[PDB]
């Protein structure tokens, strides 16, 4: 476990719900007798693609007693309110972020009926929401779907004579072949590696295979994960989080993983390629500049990503780093409120509780 | 400490308050010089007995209306009448409706209390001074911290019974150091003493289990005969469960993850907690070591306890175990070791009920009902 | 780290806010080749000095309509009628002053600036334009100290006698009158109330000028590089555990006597001592010493030995998590935990209710629910 990790080539931020935060996958396999290879021109996935499984949406509830709304007017209602004249009819409650896999494009969320939904002839452009009379709609009719998900990059396919022991990234990251498998995405053939990255290079598929690891390291990963899950348990309870606690969601080993922040009291997600950091100067060459992708990362409203913030005098507070310095800071400790809980998440079975709005 | 641990002989559930959660005693002692012996036949304690510490009950509060509101000290007789009306759907609701005056007995339940199984002394924060004793001046009821609110057990008999033994067969091992369960789990004489229960002759072992045979200071643990590293881990584990308990009592919610911290990590007698009807539930069981998940999970959807797949309640089992939507058995410790996160195991499950007369300081605000 | 730790020469209690809880400094430096030296007779700091950071105060709000800006002593007169009884409560039911207290503020004891969220933009300085009060983030509410002199004083010194230790003619450390070695590592020279002396790394000052102290002190208000790795990351475990304790207090406005004991200094030396009275948190200051055997401090189940005398406590609460049960047994959280003896009274989350309305405030007004 390096002292620290910092994302390389960070993707754009997507707003998410609290329930979307996931504890990092901290597995990383070493390089042994596998160092030489041939440079392989291959395309891999752009960082936005890994934020394609979060589809923005709103919900719609009709009334005079509640009635079953239909998509067309729900949209023009949702298009108003985005600027406001009538304010009522169809009650529009947002954000309603859902997950969806790239393959069947199935949607998954507690606000959707039976936990999930699939666009069908009977619902071509909406989901039912296990409410009496509320239907869920995405914010882009096309659900931010696209296949412009690849870019050119140069790596080295690693020799072991004839056989392939692994891969090495354009960044330099050794990614092994231990948990690699072959899979087409968007009509291109490529390899799917344990780490999460997909690469286009062809030779010869949530879970985790953990049989070839020393007890000591599999115990440490379980330690790490449980720590993070307690924090998640408490974030979900209190709808709040401290920048300290948020740092437990930072992928602790080099590799692809999520990067988390808070903007406008909403949790935000992006994808990056994590690189080991050995010296605080390597990412803070002076106290006021967090170096990410060769640029000072400015942040927003004093908040960078992954629990990093900026104090009252402009200095960067990296939780892990302050903690190793025994220098406590109330700003790292204060609970940041994430108020929004969507009404129809915990809903069951003349006018609902969301008569409030 | 075994990988996991599963109850044998799982007794019936009784409802408890969150405060009755009790972090397990994880002490278990070795067999290093006690080979074989003669199979003896004996009486041990039915699990239900170990739940005689808890006595279900309710509370009753006199209610005088207005005219054009007030408090009186009712008697058990028609508190019990109004309580029974509340159990079936008699218009006891009409009672709590609003010169002209109305008398009503406001029933508030559950009010589970703790009881000295011998003193028969009940303990609660609802009882006046946190305890109560039946007397000729209160034959069948108790006083609370509210002068106009009485406490009454649901069973006039407070489940006091002596039908608490029954027949079991095991092995007395020769050296004589201890006895082997009908479950085959060694118990040592280490930390044992003598005592009489329902007039009977028997020994109590460190486990607390009682067996009928003979070949006397008697709750406590001494833990001297324990190496440093182990007692550190016992403390480590216990403090970890106490953290869970503190947050449970505060938040009045509990996640199945954390619920698993109350299971006895070692074989022997201990409690088994589950959640039925939005209420904590307690039963007693004899715990058995587990070395391979497939011994309890003959397939993904069957949890093996007392020979049968446990059906579980509301797709939820005990000790933090649940069923997913398809029936898959989620055992927290198991999932955790596979690095497989489940929100079902993380959602804080609400145990909302909090009795008004707990920590009440001498018409009342608790009264709009 | 000693099994436990007990405050010697315990000063008085100052009511603090929850946010004023601080996680201890568990550093301590051993002796190597620093055995004996010359006895000395010095001045050291009264423990109350270390709570001079906390200036009590109240806020006075002018009601007539709160639409009236109150004069400073239209407010003290109102506040002193709250302290006792009087018509105060009858103005609240033409000109009247709603008093809202406590309103503790931190103060830098040299430039005398006060800081708190009830103050305008979170801080305050006296000026000829407010020689005896402060502004709030509400235009009709001022803030006023409880003492005109904000606890300022130079009567902060006490006479005690130490041992000045020698390796060579180089001085390596002191031995306070309690007996506890305090090294010279990270010591500096400073002037308090016009006396000059050395500030040792433990938060203590003694008047006694020694050689090789050519550098003066920067901020009274830690750093640490020459310590065993194992030790430094042990300390980080303790700090982090205390910081978690604190994150939940601030959120929930409550704390258990289990949790509270995580704030006690794990090593001998100057440290804060915390308790609750009257549903308010409370800080004091003492010179902690190692406890090696519980009976040293618990000679008998009902008496906790602090400064020769049994500590009475207040409402069954003595400090640092120590409480008295229904019998009057002394429950030291650490001691109960090592015996695996659970007690609900330790787990119980004790409420710290008070939230002064004017914290981050931004006709008539809403918190004016007549009090
Ligand atoms: C007194 O000294 C303190 C330094 O401890 C100064 O504190 C700063 O005050 C500004 C506003 O006045 C705050 O925004 C800063 O956060 C404070 N810094 C610290 C370190 O507390 C204070 O300004 C000084 N006052 C005077 C009059 O010199
Ligand atoms: C009023 C009511 O709901 N009663 C039921 C009871 O019949 C049942 O035995 C128990 C199981 O725990 O659950 C409850
Ligand atoms: C946050 O809110 C402000 C105010 O409405 C808005 O202008 C801003 O664009 C929002 N944040 C981002 C990242 O756009
Ligand atoms: C029963 O025992 C408890 C302590 O174990 C005591 O508080 C209670 O008063 C006793 N009552 C009687 C009647 O012995
Ligand atoms: C606590 O409150 C009482 C008044 O009820 C008062 O007499 C006592 O001095 C207070 N003690 C402290 C330490 O504040």
Author numbering:
A (entry chain C): 2 to 65, 85 to 108, 131 to 246, 252, 261 to 404, 410 to 417
B (entry chain B): 2 to 69, 84 to 113, 126 to 202, 206 to 245, 250 to 252, 261 to 404, 411 to 417
C (entry chain A): 2 to 66, 85 to 112, 129 to 256, 263 to 403, 410 to 418
What does the paper say about this structure?
Glycoprotein (G), as the sole protein on the virion surface, is a key factor mediating lyssavirus invasion. After receptor engagement, lyssavirus enters the cell via an endocytic pathway, during which the G protein undergoes a series of pH-dependent conformational transitions to catalyze the fusion of the viral envelope with the endosomal membranes, thereby initiating the infection. The lyssavirus G, which belongs to the rhabdovirus G family, has been defined as a class III viral membrane-fusion protein. Similar to its vesiculovirus homolog, RABV-G also consists of three domains: FD, PHD, and CD.
We successfully crystallized the IKOV-G-ecto protein at pH 8.3 and determined the structure at 2.9-Å resolution. In the crystallographic asymmetric unit, a total of six IKOV-G molecules, which are of essentially the same structure, are observed to assemble into two IKOV-G trimers. Overall, the solved structure clearly shows a bended hairpin conformation. Rather than forming a single elongated helix F and extending out from FD in the intermediate conformation, the residues L380-H384 of IKOV-G adopt a loop conformation, resulting helix F into two short helices (F1 and F2) connected via an inter-helix loop. The inter-loop and helix F2, however, turn back to facilitate the following CTR loop being trapped in a surface groove on FD. The segment composed of W395-T412 in CTR interacts with FD, both through hydrogen bonds (H-bonds) and hydrophobic force. Within the trimeric architecture, three protomers are converged together via the CD domain, with three C-helices almost juxtaposed to each other to form an inverse frustum-cone with top and bottom radii of about 10.5 Å and 6 Å, respectively. Instead, most inter-protomeric interactions arise from the contacts between helix C in one protomer and helix D and the F1-interloop-F2 element in the neighboring protomer. In comparison to the previously reported structures of pre-fusion RABV-G determined by Cryo-EM, IKOV-G exhibits a similar trimeric architecture. Taken together, these results indicate that we have solved the structure of IKOV-G in the pre-fusion state.
